[model samples]
Target: GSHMGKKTKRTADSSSSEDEEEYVVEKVLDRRMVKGQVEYLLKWKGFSEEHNTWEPEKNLDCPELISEFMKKYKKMKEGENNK
Candidate 1:
């Protein structure tokens, strides 16, 4: 009942030439078992609920959005390690 969407083009300025970024939405975990988490993801940077979309960090090595994802993931991993 689900499928991969089309590739979307992105643009960035000269200041962002260091990092290579790309994005994809995989059905990592089915929502059938979870009630409200019916369609969440290992969401990437540049995600927009308004557009039902996301893009990888644009051009730069550390776009704020990607940084945010890394920060959250690192913390979550640490918690898991503790457990």
Candidate 2:
């Protein structure tokens, strides 16, 4: 209902919005969330850092979801961190 409505509105508006001539893109960093409580606990305890950090671990049920997340995240981060 509301979700579909918003999606429809955004799709309609996105086409009509003025496009920026110049833009920057940022690489995806490791903001990945851990899987289960045990793994998440290890992550929050800085285990990933101890291992020189990491992307989402093998236990993440949907690794591909992170690819989509990274796409949106880079877009947002470029906008937010823009100079």
Candidate 3:
């Protein structure tokens, strides 16, 4: 990351796209449900605190990153309601 180079590994490790490639990513932070919950809060990479957003699973395509994230994201109960 010294030069901040090479398109961030296409995942954050996709190397190739699932057909391509936000992912400007960091970690998966939160998860909430509505009619049915699937999205997870994504902590994207940015200038220090400029680092996060809400998005659905459908928009996510980073296999390694998501699996990588799950290593740390094993506490949530699948889905939950939000205000």
Candidate 4:
């Protein structure tokens, strides 16, 4: 009941390219911006926290998860400003 993702793609390797399978994104943690792009700090299901990664929104197929994190983020920010 979780979600995630992975990599390795190149035009030159078209012939040799092999499919990389599932990564369940267990949780979406911190968020940061790089060069005006949004990158979510992600925790993969079944993966060690140390291996957690940062991925741009487009790269993540987990739209629900992204939105989930977004809602959570805004709530936290709201709390932060509530004093």
* Global lDDT of each candidate: 0.43, 0.44, 0.62, 0.75
**Model 3, which residues run further than 4 Å from truth?**
1-23, 47-51, 75-83
**Most TM-score-accurate candidate:** 4
Candidate 4 backbone collisions, by pair: 3-24, 3-25, 4-23, 4-24, 4-25
Tens digit of per-residue lDDT, candidate 3, span 1-83: 37755564444534764633333766666566677757777765553545457777787665576786666555453534442
* Root-mean-square deviation (CA) per prediction: 22.0, 20.9, 17.3, 19.2
* Highest-scoring model, lDDT: 4
Better of 1 and 4 by lDDT: 4
| Candidate 2 lDDT score at position 24 | 22
Evaluated against the true structure, the overall lDDT of model 3 is 0.62
The whole-model C-alpha lDDT of candidate 1 against the native structure comes to 0.43
Clashes of each: 0, 0, 1, 5
Can you give the lDDT of residue 2 in candidate 1?
A: 71
